[model samples]
Target: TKKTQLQLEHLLLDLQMILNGINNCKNPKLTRMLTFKFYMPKKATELKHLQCLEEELKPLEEVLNLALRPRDLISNINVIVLELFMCEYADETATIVEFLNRWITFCQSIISTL
Candidate 1:
Protein backbone atom coordinates (compact mmCIF):
# COMPACT_ATOMS: atom_id res chain seq x y z
CA THR A 1 0.00 0.00 0.00
CA LYS A 2 2.79 2.41 0.81
CA LYS A 3 4.53 1.54 -2.42
CA THR A 4 1.42 2.28 -4.38
CA GLN A 5 0.99 5.51 -2.48
CA LEU A 6 4.53 6.58 -3.28
CA GLN A 7 4.18 5.59 -6.91
CA LEU A 8 0.98 7.55 -7.28
CA GLU A 9 2.48 10.53 -5.53
CA HIS A 10 5.47 10.59 -7.86
CA LEU A 11 3.25 10.52 -10.89
CA LEU A 12 0.97 13.21 -9.45
CA LEU A 13 3.97 15.44 -8.82
CA ASP A 14 5.08 15.00 -12.39
CA LEU A 15 1.60 15.87 -13.59
CA GLN A 16 1.52 18.92 -11.34
CA MET A 17 4.84 20.11 -12.71
CA ILE A 18 3.67 19.47 -16.23
CA LEU A 19 0.65 21.62 -15.48
CA ASN A 20 2.84 24.34 -14.09
CA GLY A 21 5.16 24.13 -17.06
CA ILE A 22 2.28 24.56 -19.44
CA ASN A 23 0.95 27.50 -17.48
CA ASN A 24 4.38 29.05 -17.09
CA CYS A 25 4.92 29.56 -20.82
CA LYS A 26 3.55 32.36 -22.89
CA ASN A 27 0.32 31.84 -24.81
CA PRO A 28 0.56 31.68 -28.56
CA LYS A 29 -2.02 32.16 -31.27
CA LEU A 30 -2.56 29.43 -33.79
CA THR A 31 -5.04 28.81 -36.57
CA ARG A 32 -5.24 25.05 -36.08
CA MET A 33 -4.62 22.67 -33.19
CA LEU A 34 -2.04 19.92 -33.65
CA THR A 35 -3.36 16.44 -34.42
CA PHE A 36 -0.92 14.78 -32.00
CA LYS A 37 -2.30 12.74 -29.07
CA PHE A 38 -1.10 11.88 -25.57
CA TYR A 39 -0.47 8.21 -24.81
CA MET A 40 -0.19 5.97 -21.72
CA PRO A 41 1.10 2.41 -21.79
CA LYS A 42 -1.42 -0.36 -21.25
CA LYS A 43 0.81 -2.23 -18.82
CA ALA A 44 0.07 -1.59 -15.14
CA THR A 45 3.70 -1.04 -14.13
CA GLU A 46 4.42 1.25 -17.04
CA LEU A 47 1.24 3.21 -16.47
CA LYS A 48 2.26 3.65 -12.85
CA HIS A 49 5.51 5.11 -14.11
CA LEU A 50 3.45 7.86 -15.64
CA GLN A 51 1.89 8.44 -12.20
CA CYS A 52 -1.44 7.06 -13.20
CA LEU A 53 -3.79 5.76 -10.48
CA GLU A 54 -5.18 3.04 -12.72
CA GLU A 55 -3.64 0.78 -15.32
CA GLU A 56 -5.42 2.90 -17.87
CA LEU A 57 -6.03 6.52 -16.93
CA LYS A 58 -8.61 6.75 -19.66
CA PRO A 59 -7.44 7.90 -23.08
CA LEU A 60 -7.56 11.58 -23.93
CA GLU A 61 -8.88 10.73 -27.36
CA GLU A 62 -11.68 8.70 -25.82
CA VAL A 63 -12.57 11.45 -23.38
CA LEU A 64 -12.38 14.40 -25.79
CA ASN A 65 -13.38 12.51 -28.91
CA LEU A 66 -10.49 14.21 -30.69
CA ALA A 67 -8.73 12.15 -33.32
CA LEU A 68 -4.92 12.31 -32.79
CA ARG A 69 -1.52 10.78 -33.39
CA PRO A 70 -0.11 8.49 -30.68
CA ARG A 71 2.99 9.00 -28.49
CA ASP A 72 4.20 8.12 -24.94
CA LEU A 73 2.44 9.53 -21.86
CA ILE A 74 4.93 12.31 -21.18
CA SER A 75 5.20 13.08 -24.86
CA ASN A 76 1.44 13.16 -25.05
CA ILE A 77 1.28 15.52 -22.12
CA ASN A 78 4.02 17.62 -23.68
CA VAL A 79 2.16 17.90 -26.93
CA ILE A 80 -0.83 19.18 -25.05
CA VAL A 81 1.55 21.43 -23.20
CA LEU A 82 2.92 22.47 -26.56
CA GLU A 83 -0.60 23.17 -27.66
CA LEU A 84 -1.42 25.01 -24.46
CA PHE A 85 1.73 27.04 -24.66
CA MET A 86 0.88 28.32 -28.10
CA CYS A 87 -2.89 27.95 -27.97
CA GLU A 88 -5.19 30.97 -28.29
CA TYR A 89 -8.71 30.08 -27.29
CA ALA A 90 -10.26 29.60 -23.87
CA ASP A 91 -12.52 26.78 -25.00
CA GLU A 92 -9.58 24.87 -26.45
CA THR A 93 -7.42 25.48 -23.40
CA ALA A 94 -10.45 24.57 -21.30
CA THR A 95 -10.49 21.08 -22.78
CA ILE A 96 -6.76 20.54 -22.17
CA VAL A 97 -6.82 21.88 -18.62
CA GLU A 98 -9.86 19.81 -17.77
CA PHE A 99 -8.17 16.70 -19.08
CA LEU A 100 -5.09 17.24 -16.92
CA ASN A 101 -7.08 18.24 -13.87
CA ARG A 102 -9.35 15.27 -14.31
CA TRP A 103 -6.51 12.77 -14.01
CA ILE A 104 -4.80 14.66 -11.21
CA THR A 105 -8.02 14.63 -9.21
CA PHE A 106 -8.82 11.08 -10.17
CA CYS A 107 -5.44 9.83 -8.96
CA GLN A 108 -5.55 11.96 -5.84
CA SER A 109 -8.85 10.42 -4.81
CA ILE A 110 -7.47 6.92 -5.31
CA ILE A 111 -4.80 7.51 -2.61
CA SER A 112 -7.44 7.33 0.14
CA THR A 113 -8.63 3.99 -1.17
CA LEU A 114 -5.09 2.66 -0.97
Candidate 2:
Protein backbone atom coordinates (compact mmCIF):
# COMPACT_ATOMS: atom_id res chain seq x y z
CA THR A 1 0.00 0.00 0.00
CA LYS A 2 2.83 2.35 0.84
CA LYS A 3 4.57 1.37 -2.35
CA THR A 4 1.44 2.11 -4.31
CA GLN A 5 1.21 5.52 -2.73
CA LEU A 6 4.81 6.21 -3.64
CA GLN A 7 4.17 5.04 -7.18
CA LEU A 8 1.19 7.34 -7.39
CA GLU A 9 3.38 10.18 -6.26
CA HIS A 10 5.74 9.45 -9.08
CA LEU A 11 2.89 9.20 -11.52
CA LEU A 12 1.60 12.54 -10.33
CA LEU A 13 5.04 14.03 -10.80
CA ASP A 14 5.22 12.68 -14.33
CA LEU A 15 1.76 13.99 -15.06
CA GLN A 16 2.76 17.38 -13.71
CA MET A 17 5.81 17.39 -15.94
CA ILE A 18 3.72 16.54 -18.96
CA LEU A 19 1.22 19.26 -18.04
CA ASN A 20 4.07 21.74 -17.62
CA GLY A 21 5.43 20.81 -21.03
CA ILE A 22 2.02 21.33 -22.54
CA ASN A 23 1.71 24.68 -20.80
CA ASN A 24 5.03 25.82 -22.20
CA CYS A 25 3.81 25.39 -25.74
CA LYS A 26 3.20 28.50 -27.85
CA ASN A 27 -0.58 28.11 -27.91
CA PRO A 28 -2.16 29.98 -25.00
CA LYS A 29 -5.47 28.18 -25.27
CA LEU A 30 -3.89 24.78 -24.89
CA THR A 31 -1.74 26.03 -22.05
CA ARG A 32 -4.79 27.44 -20.25
CA MET A 33 -6.69 24.20 -20.72
CA LEU A 34 -3.86 22.07 -19.38
CA THR A 35 -3.54 24.35 -16.41
CA PHE A 36 -7.23 24.16 -15.68
CA LYS A 37 -7.14 20.38 -15.91
CA PHE A 38 -4.39 20.18 -13.33
CA TYR A 39 -6.01 22.59 -10.93
CA MET A 40 -9.53 21.22 -11.09
CA PRO A 41 -10.42 18.49 -8.60
CA LYS A 42 -10.54 14.97 -9.93
CA LYS A 43 -9.81 11.64 -8.22
CA ALA A 44 -7.19 12.65 -5.78
CA THR A 45 -7.31 10.34 -2.73
CA GLU A 46 -4.46 11.77 -0.79
CA LEU A 47 -3.56 15.14 0.61
CA LYS A 48 -0.19 14.90 -1.06
CA HIS A 49 -1.82 14.52 -4.45
CA LEU A 50 -4.05 17.50 -3.79
CA GLN A 51 -1.18 19.65 -2.58
CA CYS A 52 1.06 18.62 -5.43
CA LEU A 53 -1.65 19.33 -7.97
CA GLU A 54 -2.27 22.76 -6.44
CA GLU A 55 1.40 23.67 -6.37
CA GLU A 56 1.94 22.44 -9.91
CA LEU A 57 -1.06 24.41 -11.15
CA LYS A 58 -0.57 27.77 -9.40
CA PRO A 59 1.62 29.49 -11.96
CA LEU A 60 -0.49 28.32 -14.85
CA GLU A 61 -3.60 29.58 -13.11
CA GLU A 62 -2.00 32.98 -12.71
CA VAL A 63 -1.14 33.08 -16.37
CA LEU A 64 -4.63 31.95 -17.32
CA ASN A 65 -6.22 34.64 -15.17
CA LEU A 66 -4.03 37.22 -16.81
CA ALA A 67 -4.11 36.12 -20.44
CA LEU A 68 -7.47 34.42 -20.92
CA ARG A 69 -9.80 37.30 -20.13
CA PRO A 70 -12.75 37.48 -22.58
CA ARG A 71 -11.45 34.49 -24.56
CA ASP A 72 -13.89 31.80 -25.58
CA LEU A 73 -11.06 29.62 -26.80
CA ILE A 74 -9.67 29.03 -23.32
CA SER A 75 -13.11 28.41 -21.85
CA ASN A 76 -14.00 25.93 -24.56
CA ILE A 77 -10.78 24.03 -24.08
CA ASN A 78 -11.26 23.97 -20.31
CA VAL A 79 -14.80 22.69 -20.71
CA ILE A 80 -13.61 19.74 -22.79
CA VAL A 81 -10.80 18.93 -20.44
CA LEU A 82 -13.11 19.18 -17.43
CA GLU A 83 -15.55 16.83 -19.03
CA LEU A 84 -12.78 14.33 -19.64
CA PHE A 85 -11.58 14.73 -16.08
CA MET A 86 -15.07 14.08 -14.77
CA CYS A 87 -15.23 10.88 -16.79
CA GLU A 88 -11.98 9.82 -15.22
CA TYR A 89 -13.20 10.65 -11.74
CA ALA A 90 -16.36 8.64 -12.14
CA ASP A 91 -14.53 5.67 -13.65
CA GLU A 92 -17.32 5.35 -16.15
CA THR A 93 -16.25 3.57 -19.31
CA ALA A 94 -19.35 4.54 -21.23
CA THR A 95 -18.76 8.20 -20.52
CA ILE A 96 -15.14 7.82 -21.46
CA VAL A 97 -16.10 6.06 -24.67
CA GLU A 98 -18.50 8.77 -25.68
CA PHE A 99 -16.08 11.50 -24.69
CA LEU A 100 -13.31 9.84 -26.62
CA ASN A 101 -15.47 9.56 -29.69
CA ARG A 102 -16.22 13.27 -29.63
CA TRP A 103 -12.65 14.04 -28.66
CA ILE A 104 -11.31 12.02 -31.56
CA THR A 105 -13.53 13.91 -33.95
CA PHE A 106 -12.47 17.23 -32.47
CA CYS A 107 -8.79 16.29 -32.55
CA GLN A 108 -8.98 14.97 -36.05
CA SER A 109 -10.58 18.18 -37.25
CA ILE A 110 -8.19 20.44 -35.34
CA ILE A 111 -4.91 18.83 -34.25
CA SER A 112 -4.37 16.91 -37.46
CA THR A 113 -4.49 20.15 -39.37
CA LEU A 114 -1.93 21.73 -37.09
Task: Name the best candidate (by TM-score).
Answer: 1
- The regions of model 1 sitting more than 4 angstroms off are 29-94
CA shift of 97, model 2, Å: 19
Give residue 91's error in model 1 in angstroms.
16
Whole-model Cα lDDT per candidate? 0.45, 0.37
For residue 90, give model 2's deviation from the true position in Å.
Answer: 7.0
lDDT of 2 by residue, 8-110 (tens): 3443343344445444657765544433332232444333323323333344444445542244433433433333222233332222123223333433333
**Candidate 1 on 1-114: residue-level lDDT in tens?**
676677567656656765664455445511122233343322222222343323223554343333222435555453332322121222222344444666677557766577
Rate residue 40 of model 2 by lDDT: 30
* Candidate 1, lDDT over the whole model: 0.45
Error of 2 at 57 (Å): 21
Q: Check candidate 1 and list the clashing pairs.
A: 11-51, 38-76
Shift of residue 37 alpha carbon in model 1, Å: 7.7
